[PDB]
Design an enzyme around this catalytic site. Sequence first.
Site, PDB file in Angstrom:
ATOM      1  N   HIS A 176      55.661  -3.603  21.195  1.00  0.00           N
ATOM      2  CA  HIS A 176      56.191  -4.698  20.352  1.00  0.00           C
ATOM      3  C   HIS A 176      55.174  -5.310  19.378  1.00  0.00           C
ATOM      4  O   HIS A 176      55.342  -6.446  18.953  1.00  0.00           O
ATOM      5  CB  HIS A 176      56.962  -5.746  21.189  1.00  0.00           C
ATOM      6  CG  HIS A 176      58.075  -6.423  20.455  1.00  0.00           C
ATOM      7  ND1 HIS A 176      57.890  -7.201  19.337  1.00  0.00           N
ATOM      8  CD2 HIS A 176      59.399  -6.443  20.695  1.00  0.00           C
ATOM      9  CE1 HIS A 176      59.058  -7.661  18.934  1.00  0.00           C
ATOM     10  NE2 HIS A 176      59.985  -7.217  19.740  1.00  0.00           N
ATOM     11  N   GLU A 188      60.048 -10.151  29.001  1.00  0.00           N
ATOM     12  CA  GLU A 188      60.558  -9.583  27.743  1.00  0.00           C
ATOM     13  C   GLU A 188      59.635  -8.474  27.239  1.00  0.00           C
ATOM     14  O   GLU A 188      60.072  -7.403  26.853  1.00  0.00           O
ATOM     15  CB  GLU A 188      60.800 -10.699  26.686  1.00  0.00           C
ATOM     16  CG  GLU A 188      59.533 -11.391  26.133  1.00  0.00           C
ATOM     17  CD  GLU A 188      59.814 -12.596  25.279  1.00  0.00           C
ATOM     18  OE1 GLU A 188      60.612 -12.494  24.297  1.00  0.00           O
ATOM     19  OE2 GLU A 188      59.231 -13.654  25.580  1.00  0.00           O
ATOM     20  N   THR A 189      58.346  -8.744  27.320  1.00  0.00           N
ATOM     21  CA  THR A 189      57.282  -7.858  26.842  1.00  0.00           C
ATOM     22  C   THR A 189      56.102  -8.006  27.796  1.00  0.00           C
ATOM     23  O   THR A 189      55.782  -9.147  28.205  1.00  0.00           O
ATOM     24  CB  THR A 189      56.881  -8.277  25.381  1.00  0.00           C
ATOM     25  OG1 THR A 189      58.066  -8.191  24.547  1.00  0.00           O
ATOM     26  CG2 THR A 189      55.691  -7.424  24.854  1.00  0.00           C
ATOM     27  N   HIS A 228      40.354   6.664  37.504  1.00  0.00           N
ATOM     28  CA  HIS A 228      40.225   5.240  37.845  1.00  0.00           C
ATOM     29  C   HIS A 228      40.623   4.904  39.257  1.00  0.00           C
ATOM     30  O   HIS A 228      40.234   3.883  39.829  1.00  0.00           O
ATOM     31  CB  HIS A 228      41.040   4.410  36.882  1.00  0.00           C
ATOM     32  CG  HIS A 228      40.512   4.409  35.480  1.00  0.00           C
ATOM     33  ND1 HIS A 228      41.031   3.580  34.521  1.00  0.00           N
ATOM     34  CD2 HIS A 228      39.508   5.094  34.883  1.00  0.00           C
ATOM     35  CE1 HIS A 228      40.383   3.771  33.372  1.00  0.00           C
ATOM     36  NE2 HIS A 228      39.465   4.696  33.559  1.00  0.00           N
ATOM     37  N   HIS A 288      58.087  -3.061  25.725  1.00  0.00           N
ATOM     38  CA  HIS A 288      59.277  -3.853  25.614  1.00  0.00           C
ATOM     39  C   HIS A 288      60.481  -2.943  25.597  1.00  0.00           C
ATOM     40  O   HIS A 288      60.442  -1.877  24.941  1.00  0.00           O
ATOM     41  CB  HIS A 288      59.199  -4.651  24.312  1.00  0.00           C
ATOM     42  CG  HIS A 288      60.450  -5.341  23.926  1.00  0.00           C
ATOM     43  ND1 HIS A 288      60.722  -6.632  24.309  1.00  0.00           N
ATOM     44  CD2 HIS A 288      61.476  -4.952  23.110  1.00  0.00           C
ATOM     45  CE1 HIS A 288      61.911  -6.971  23.827  1.00  0.00           C
ATOM     46  NE2 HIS A 288      62.348  -6.003  23.039  1.00  0.00           N
ATOM     47  N   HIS A 329      34.679  19.964  29.778  1.00  0.00           N
ATOM     48  CA  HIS A 329      35.508  18.870  30.131  1.00  0.00           C
ATOM     49  C   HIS A 329      35.166  18.435  31.554  1.00  0.00           C
ATOM     50  O   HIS A 329      34.309  19.036  32.229  1.00  0.00           O
ATOM     51  CB  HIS A 329      36.950  19.301  30.067  1.00  0.00           C
ATOM     52  CG  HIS A 329      37.412  19.732  28.703  1.00  0.00           C
ATOM     53  ND1 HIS A 329      37.675  18.841  27.682  1.00  0.00           N
ATOM     54  CD2 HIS A 329      37.618  20.979  28.192  1.00  0.00           C
ATOM     55  CE1 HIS A 329      38.053  19.534  26.612  1.00  0.00           C
ATOM     56  NE2 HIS A 329      37.996  20.833  26.890  1.00  0.00           N
ATOM     57  N   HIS A 372      37.304  12.799  23.525  1.00  0.00           N
ATOM     58  CA  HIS A 372      38.156  13.582  24.396  1.00  0.00           C
ATOM     59  C   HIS A 372      39.377  12.758  24.834  1.00  0.00           C
ATOM     60  O   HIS A 372      40.475  13.274  24.901  1.00  0.00           O
ATOM     61  CB  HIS A 372      37.379  14.082  25.608  1.00  0.00           C
ATOM     62  CG  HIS A 372      36.523  15.268  25.316  1.00  0.00           C
ATOM     63  ND1 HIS A 372      36.639  16.471  25.984  1.00  0.00           N
ATOM     64  CD2 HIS A 372      35.565  15.442  24.370  1.00  0.00           C
ATOM     65  CE1 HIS A 372      35.785  17.334  25.434  1.00  0.00           C
ATOM     66  NE2 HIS A 372      35.124  16.741  24.460  1.00  0.00           N
ATOM     67  N   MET A 390      43.332  13.606  26.296  1.00  0.00           N
ATOM     68  CA  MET A 390      42.960  13.935  27.678  1.00  0.00           C
ATOM     69  C   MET A 390      43.066  12.695  28.626  1.00  0.00           C
ATOM     70  O   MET A 390      42.064  12.126  29.082  1.00  0.00           O
ATOM     71  CB  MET A 390      41.610  14.620  27.775  1.00  0.00           C
ATOM     72  CG  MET A 390      41.553  15.900  26.931  1.00  0.00           C
ATOM     73  SD  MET A 390      40.198  16.949  27.422  1.00  0.00           S
ATOM     74  CE  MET A 390      40.822  17.570  29.041  1.00  0.00           C
ATOM     75  N   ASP A 440      37.681  11.774  35.133  1.00  0.00           N
ATOM     76  CA  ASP A 440      37.314  10.429  35.617  1.00  0.00           C
ATOM     77  C   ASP A 440      38.675   9.830  36.119  1.00  0.00           C
ATOM     78  O   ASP A 440      39.586   9.610  35.309  1.00  0.00           O
ATOM     79  CB  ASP A 440      36.716   9.607  34.442  1.00  0.00           C
ATOM     80  CG  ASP A 440      36.509   8.117  34.734  1.00  0.00           C
ATOM     81  OD1 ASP A 440      36.987   7.555  35.771  1.00  0.00           O
ATOM     82  OD2 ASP A 440      35.861   7.469  33.837  1.00  0.00           O
ATOM     83  N   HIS A 472      41.211  10.319  32.999  1.00  0.00           N
ATOM     84  CA  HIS A 472      40.919  10.864  31.692  1.00  0.00           C
ATOM     85  C   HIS A 472      39.673  11.698  31.742  1.00  0.00           C
ATOM     86  O   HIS A 472      38.847  11.503  32.623  1.00  0.00           O
ATOM     87  CB  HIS A 472      40.797   9.780  30.618  1.00  0.00           C
ATOM     88  CG  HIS A 472      39.728   8.787  30.874  1.00  0.00           C
ATOM     89  ND1 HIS A 472      38.404   9.005  30.554  1.00  0.00           N
ATOM     90  CD2 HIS A 472      39.801   7.526  31.356  1.00  0.00           C
ATOM     91  CE1 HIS A 472      37.695   7.936  30.888  1.00  0.00           C
ATOM     92  NE2 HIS A 472      38.524   7.008  31.340  1.00  0.00           N
ATOM     93  N   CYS A 473      39.516  12.575  30.744  1.00  0.00           N
ATOM     94  CA  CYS A 473      38.271  13.323  30.570  1.00  0.00           C
ATOM     95  C   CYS A 473      37.203  12.351  30.061  1.00  0.00           C
ATOM     96  O   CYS A 473      37.506  11.311  29.428  1.00  0.00           O
ATOM     97  CB  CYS A 473      38.518  14.470  29.587  1.00  0.00           C
ATOM     98  SG  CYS A 473      37.158  15.629  29.406  1.00  0.00           S
TER      99      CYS A 473
HETATM  100 CU    CU Z   1      37.637  16.848  27.702  1.00  0.00          CU
HETATM  101 CU    CU Z   2      62.074  -7.420  20.117  1.00  0.00          CU
HETATM  102 CU    CU Z   3      37.831   4.925  32.372  1.00  0.00          CU
END
Ligand code: CU
Ligand code: CU
Ligand code: CU
Lengths: 335, 335, 335
Positions: free
Chosen positions: A299, A272-273, A93, A248, A88, A138, A143, A91, A128-129
């Site tokens: 939603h 709303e969303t 961001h 939502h 593993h 993964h 992950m 990463d 994430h892995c």
């Molecule tokens: Cu992994």
């Molecule tokens: Cu709704």
């Molecule tokens: Cu990424």
Amino acid sequence: DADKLPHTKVTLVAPPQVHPHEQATKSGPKVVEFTMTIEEKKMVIDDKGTTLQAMTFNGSMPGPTLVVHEGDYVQLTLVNPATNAMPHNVDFHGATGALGGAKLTNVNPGEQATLRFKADRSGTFVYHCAPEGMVPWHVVSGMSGTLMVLPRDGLKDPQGKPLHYDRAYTIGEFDLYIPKGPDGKYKDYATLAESYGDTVQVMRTLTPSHIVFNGKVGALTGANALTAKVGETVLLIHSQANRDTRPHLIGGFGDWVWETGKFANPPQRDLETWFIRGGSAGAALYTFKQPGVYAYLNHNLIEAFELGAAGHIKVEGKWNDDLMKQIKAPAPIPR
Amino acid sequence: DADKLPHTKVTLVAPPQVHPHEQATKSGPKVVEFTMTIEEKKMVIDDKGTTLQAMTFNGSMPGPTLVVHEGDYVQLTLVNPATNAMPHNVDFHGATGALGGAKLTNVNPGEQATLRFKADRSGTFVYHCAPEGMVPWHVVSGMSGTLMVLPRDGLKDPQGKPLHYDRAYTIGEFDLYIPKGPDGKYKDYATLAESYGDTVQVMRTLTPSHIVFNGKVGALTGANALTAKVGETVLLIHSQANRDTRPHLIGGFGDWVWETGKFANPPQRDLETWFIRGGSAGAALYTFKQPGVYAYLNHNLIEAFELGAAGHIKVEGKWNDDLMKQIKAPAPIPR
Amino acid sequence: DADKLPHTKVTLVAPPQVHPHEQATKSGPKVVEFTMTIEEKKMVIDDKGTTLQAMTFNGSMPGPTLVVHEGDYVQLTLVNPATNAMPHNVDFHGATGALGGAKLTNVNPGEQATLRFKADRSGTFVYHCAPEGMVPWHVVSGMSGTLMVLPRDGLKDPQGKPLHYDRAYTIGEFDLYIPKGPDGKYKDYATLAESYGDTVQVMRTLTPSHIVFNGKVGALTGANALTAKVGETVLLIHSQANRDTRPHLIGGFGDWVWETGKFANPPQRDLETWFIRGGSAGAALYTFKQPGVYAYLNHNLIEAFELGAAGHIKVEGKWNDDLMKQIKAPAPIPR
Ligand SMILES: [Cu+2]
Ligand SMILES: [Cu+2]
Ligand SMILES: [Cu+2]
Ligand SMILES: [Cu+2]
Ligand SMILES: [Cu+2]
Ligand SMILES: [Cu+2]
Ligand SMILES: [Zn+2]
Ligand SMILES: [Zn+2]
Ligand SMILES: [Zn+2]
Ligand SMILES: [Zn+2]
Ligand SMILES: [Zn+2]
Ligand SMILES: [Zn+2]
């Protein structure tokens, strides 16, 4: 530089809680030290006993949320115990260079590594892995999680006025790709490795078998419902490391939302969303004004109610008839 | 009016490069003259020899990027040689009226036409073929690209401060719908026309067989990796004429991003992943701070790694330990 | 409080029209009274006679648009006649508490109920039916529409300048999930209840059989095309209660767009294509400058042209050669 600053050590907590932290702070930059340990395990992901050959940071889907302030350095020790089968890495961001740290944190079972990077941008960011040649597997197997980098002086509205939350929750939404056998029943695998080929074939269809919050259908319901009270502002952090979603709150709003998750940008109000791009984390604030059990969901209502992408928030306090009133209860239609 | 202004003639260049142009300019409006020639051809789109009965502007997927300034007039001569089988046209999202120009540029094989329109709005805009009754087929088979209309005084940040790029790249992302026969193998067609019916059936499923940058799996990798250096700001133009995508730079950011692609709007900053609506082009700026090979990809990681929507950017310069440092290399877990 | 204010009664009109209303108003808050009656009915949804066992507010897909001003109270009487088979309710995204009103408007056939809530946020908001345990089915079968809450002083641009429309249209986009039998033909059901199980299986695939505006393929074409004239600004309200969409005007723009649909946020300008998150309504303004028949569509062009998500707008007035000119009509390529 970073070698000069004070260090702090944070103890992580399991989702949907987020470890204690300050928003606006008078503290200066620190090296903030975290540790995570990877656990591969088979997990039951729905109400009928379907299993996932899962991969996790710290035993949970999502991994825990790590919280620092802009200008801090994140120093993660990543532990891959010998009880695991696969290699593993991580990463972030929020990090600059070396494929997010992936190139520098390749840990085979029985190994660990320590990565530092400067958290120079405010926002909620996916980590994430991403092991070479098996990245999506993964990720979809569990992950991922969130790094939240708060501005040093706290959150701000579009006019530069202060915003805050009283309570934070972290929701990771997982598109799962569980294979079926010829009988139409989901397959159960004795080992992680044995699930790989069949799972890739399901992945390539782009159709999830399940889409779950926090690792399981109904994870955030019943005894495990999120909680709040009238008058409290809650931050809802929503990560989706692979696929888009559209959060939502039924009977509520996103009062202030950073749907792309980056706090140096002005938030939008009265949503709303909102929309979480696959590969990102976003953040919404909402101040409850009515008690009751809310739903918090994706939603696409098929994704939510059929496939699993829904939770509940149980809110205490007094009902406000000015905001909403039943004027006439359901009763027969008149002659 | 337009009949008064000076004319200029631009020579287009093939993606991922973009023809030389100024950003901020002291030049006044011009009629800017371009020509494109349509080429239908069979193209190999993956590493196992799968072919697409493809349709292109200028021989490439995407077509070349055309760059003008706000208030210029675009004057395109569109050539459909007799060596082609189908009629074609062009719909510029940057143009007003006549279905984007489509109604005025219907060229059968052996014909050409010349369209002028005023580029009165700044932004990156999709152009694509749109022949009556076969619009999606011509789009998904490769007939799209970008028109970039720069503000006359260059790009601006949300506070009106100047932004710029040092180098520009253009990436077109193509959702392909290649049919299979009963043996489960992709079909190879002797002619464009013969691919039509089977391809429409695959289209209607909404599941691409492949999703590629610039016409092929791995188009933007190896010898064809994009390139930059530490300290350079790159503009990444990303077009998707049919389907949504979610660009991301692994180990980088979108420092300033116009995800809807329209430069009169303030950009967002510090993005991890942004969103290109199907039917649009967006634009991201990033200033490299670390050397290494980056990935630039659609962060539906199945779409990227399984289906083809990923490229590489190879970046020269010096490593910065303040931004990221390996504190402890992978090593055994301690007793 | 709300018990003090004057009441008004509004008569709803069928989509794509929107009932008469003021934008900026000198009126103070009111209790605004509406009534809707639910009609279950079988509807023909395409050109080949496919039927949907449909559920509607007021007989139409979408339900009618309700228009109030920020600070008004919406007072809806919801009628479920005895001629219907199922229970229904209403969830207003513009309302606070009780799952949008759903918990307070559960009406079995032969019953009605009256709900009041404060419309305290400006925007276009989805309303939809949401009966416990069958939410997505009632939504996808047609039970949604829009509440538009206008700011009291009308729409504003990012600099606080006034915006307006001269004419409003309301488009509801419906992802339909019609089952097929073993012969590959769409199934026709004698009753609503009989369609349920088969439809849920199609829903779970996440692949619509059809995606239609206003209830049917070609609803907004021919005699039923939307209409405008050069110089008129049109508001296009676009609701999608279940699934994302990406509206686009071919040969036009979104001059000012609130894609998340919430008018207290600044609009974006000069859009080619915008994005309506499933579970939301958005709003676009466009001032026509060229006559002709436009298409208004979802710019996943497969969704639009194959599956049904496209309409037409027929625009009267004089052609403007400065904006666009055919310089050379299609003609043979020269020697
Ligand atoms: Cu992994
Ligand atoms: Cu709704
Ligand atoms: Cu990424
Ligand atoms: Cu064409
Ligand atoms: Cu178009
Ligand atoms: Cu209903
Ligand atoms: Zn130190
Ligand atoms: Zn508070
Ligand atoms: Zn001239
Ligand atoms: Zn520069
Ligand atoms: Zn009253
Ligand atoms: Zn007007």
